[PDB]
């Protein structure tokens, strides 16, 4: 995958499973154009979002749906998504794994960018 | 302070000093409208951004400039900003502190929301 | 303060208040000698742990008590403490803030080391 | 795998490759006894550390060597290790993945525990 997204639930110590993810690419105007979407697997991963040729250079936003992920815990999170923006392929071709460790009011997110 | 932003450099273990912070609010033509801005202090803190009156319920984005903050390190970051989005005042008025611990390819943020 | 510890609850979005903190300094024998302790304030902070005189060069462990912090959420955490180890004043005189953002199965810590 | 460790370099945005990891278990005399060790792969991962039968309930410390990992960056880190302590299995046999996103003066760890 040129791009994969990993989501972990830092409250329960588990992959975040069957969580909706939206990817956008910043358009000519300021706007976020829909790029790819899906839901995480049993390992918290979302594979197969894009291909090398559709994954052109640009600014990408990854939005992970969180609003009600937390509901069973009794907590409303800081925002209905966890989002991370990254600038891609601006020096040539690269695989990106976006790793998110999520809590209702905190998250850590790392971009692992390889050959 | 209804809204405070605190920025830490996780690479050198210090406050991120004199860093530009721009706050936006989602405008409902769905664009981000400029809301407040400032530069972090010697303690990495940014106070005085808004007033309990301007600071209504809504969706806010805190954009921390990092385009060149890493330059002396010789690393170009994952993105030219660090952004944190939060929904405010979904249930009455609150003080928000957005704490961002930053690295070039990572970051950890917690929103601390107090009722005072 | 030569040493202060600040604890945030990443689940609830609030300072972690009245939480026990233990500080140790590594002895001659590999043993952790107790150094200072307390409970966090209403701001999640623990001030007044040490004096610049008592804060001699060495390896320090900060242990934040988390075992039952989470009890009301119905979650038992990964460990009964959140712990961070740092090597101190290896160059002169310096003030440390140890900042911990805590969830049951994740934490982020950073050492802010000044002047 | 009962215990897997995955290390990411949060400064460069890559897997931390060929990094030494030592695992310890809290022993009878309150010391840390050596329990397993290895080096991270090209994916930042360390598999094969232990066996279901070796990995009994207890308190485990994962120590990641970071003494010179940062040297080329010109920064000496907060400590010569990144250590994560967890209380294993405390409810029956589980698989553990300890994910550590590392910077010189910070870190985020997450324990993923799966049944
Ligand atoms: Zn894949
Ligand atoms: Zn969605
Ligand atoms: Zn959003
Ligand atoms: Zn800006
Ligand atoms: Zn203020
Ligand atoms: Zn941006
Ligand atoms: Zn303790
Ligand atoms: Zn103090
Ligand atoms: Zn070691
Ligand atoms: Zn394995
Ligand atoms: Zn150590």
Swiss-Prot record, chain B:
Changing residue 82 to S: In AMYLD1; amyloid polyneuropathy. One of its GO terms (molecular function) is hormone activity. Changing residue 61 to N: In AMYLD1; amyloid polyneuropathy. Detected in serum and cerebrospinal fluid (at protein level). Highly expressed in choroid plexus epithelial cells. Detected in retina pigment epithelium and liver. Its main location: secreted. The modification Phosphoserine is found at residue 43. Changing residue 26 to N: In AMYLD1; amyloid polyneuropathy. One of its GO terms (biological process) is phototransduction, visible light. Changing residue 88 to G: In AMYLD1; amyloid polyneuropathy. It comes from the Eukaryota. Not glycosylated under normal conditions. Following unfolding, caused for example by variant AMYLD1 'Gly-38', the cryptic Asn-89 site is exposed and glycosylated by STT3B-containing OST complex, leading to its degradation by the ER-associated degradation (ERAD) pathway. The keyword Glycoprotein applies. Changing residue 9 to G: In AMYLD1; leptomeningeal amyloidosis; leads to unfolding and exposure of N-89 to glycosylation by STT3B and subsequent degradation by the ERAD pathway. Changing residue 43 to P: In AMYLD1; amyloid polyneuropathy. Changing residue 51 to A: In AMYLD1; amyloid polyneuropathy and cardiomyopathy. Changing residue 75 to N: In AMYLD1; vitrous amyloid. Changing residue 60 to H: In AMYLD1; leptomeningeal amyloidosis; vitreous amyloid in some patients. Changing residue 38 to R: In AMYLD1; amyloid polyneuropathy. Thyroid hormone-binding protein. Probably transports thyroxine from the bloodstream to the brain. This is Transthyretin. It comes from Homo sapiens. The chain holds residues 30 to 145 of 147 of the full protein.
